[PDB]
Design a binder for this molecule. Structure first.
Ligand code: FE
Ligand code: FE
Ligand code: FE
Ligand code: FE
Lengths: 124, 124, 124, 124
């Protein structure tokens, strides 16, 4: 199963586990997900976080919903060689979710050489 | 764990599990992944397969690689209402992978109302 | 040319043109792109903004770089019918760009029934 | 206009323009899009084709439809260095479109260091 390729862990001391944080404002839920909170993850042409996806499984429901996907596509690559463009997209993803439901939020991130990583938090 | 939202077994009545098939030609591995092979999954504005992702974990290695992602973006929507454009993208994905390695291939797919689905096959 | 399918205009009078705003903080450039600033764009199962992409062409250079892509994937769809999930992803995209270069930022957004839309701003 | 960053003609020496080919079978239109058909475009960790998108504008209509998007995500990167994984995703995209309409098909591709490229063909 695919779960055997997905890693998780303590974000407070790592650099791969996506950290999920949110702030509820009325019917709006602003979610921030990032890799490399405590320890910045490298962002080079050879080693970088490709994307972060956010999912939401409402409490008591059977099917998870993909809320969004953020792809970080600039990693220094240029005609002058790797790490020469001075253009890098940091692995920080923001999602504005409109819902009055509660449940669980899951984040799935992919490092180009270190596989898949996950994390989750309860959405009160 | 996000895996708690991923199903690997179809329920009788609707096909969701992405079926993986491949053909090895020299250094090339042609992979076909599809949802609803014989009995098609619905493809309406309201209910459809959004995408299929292909992953490869080489034998004996520790990090899975994302081979590709195919998004099926047309589902009949139009200014004249849902299911009126006569333009639909079928959930059939093809990937041309160049590798001489062996291992396991995983497929992850998403139904807009039925969550995540997975499958895997051994790449010999 | 694909440009014949891309529309542009005044966001103060329309509701499809992606509005670009940024803030330069040290070596970081925080870019906010959104559709429906003045006039909120519908976000229903039948009619919604699918994604917003950000591009950067550094001053004096020949090749544009894709900075990122944000996909808004929840639009009310559920097993209970269209617009019944109470889960919607608003078309607001945030990008954290690390660069000391100046140039032009382009935004490309896609509405599921109203085609492609663009906008641009000078990154000073 | 973003079109000022999109090229439609290759320069001798490197293939970038996505070549579109299709086959009509009943209500199904099988579309194949590829970069570097005759002369392969590089596919290294430092230089590679990131994705190909397919669009369809039905004859006489005003809004283009995105048919699909294929992301080629493996480019040799590994913990053992750039170009060491022996896993590369070739820039060949296949789309199965269900439609009885005619019109124009557009392809948009992106090289990580050579910007955006386009091409189009009439769907008879
Ligand atoms: Fe890493
Ligand atoms: Fe389904
Ligand atoms: Fe619209
Ligand atoms: Fe190139």
């Amino acid at each position: 199963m695919i779960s055997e390729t997905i890693r998780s862990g303590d974000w407070k001391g790592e650099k791969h586990v996506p950290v999920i944080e949110y702030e509820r404002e009325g019917e709006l839920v602003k979610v921030k997900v990032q890799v490399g909170k405590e320890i910045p993850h490298p962002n080079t042409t050879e080693h970088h976080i490709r994307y972060i996806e956010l999912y939401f499984l409402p409490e008591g429901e059977n099917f998870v919903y993909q809320v969004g996907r953020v792809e970080f596509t600039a990693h220094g690559e240029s005609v002058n060689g790797p790490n020469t463009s001075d253009v890098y997209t940091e692995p920080i993803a923001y999602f504005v979710l409109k819902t009055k439901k509660k449940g669980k939020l899951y984040a799935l991130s992919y490092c180009n050489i270190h596989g898949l990583w996950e994390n989750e938090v309860t959405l009160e």
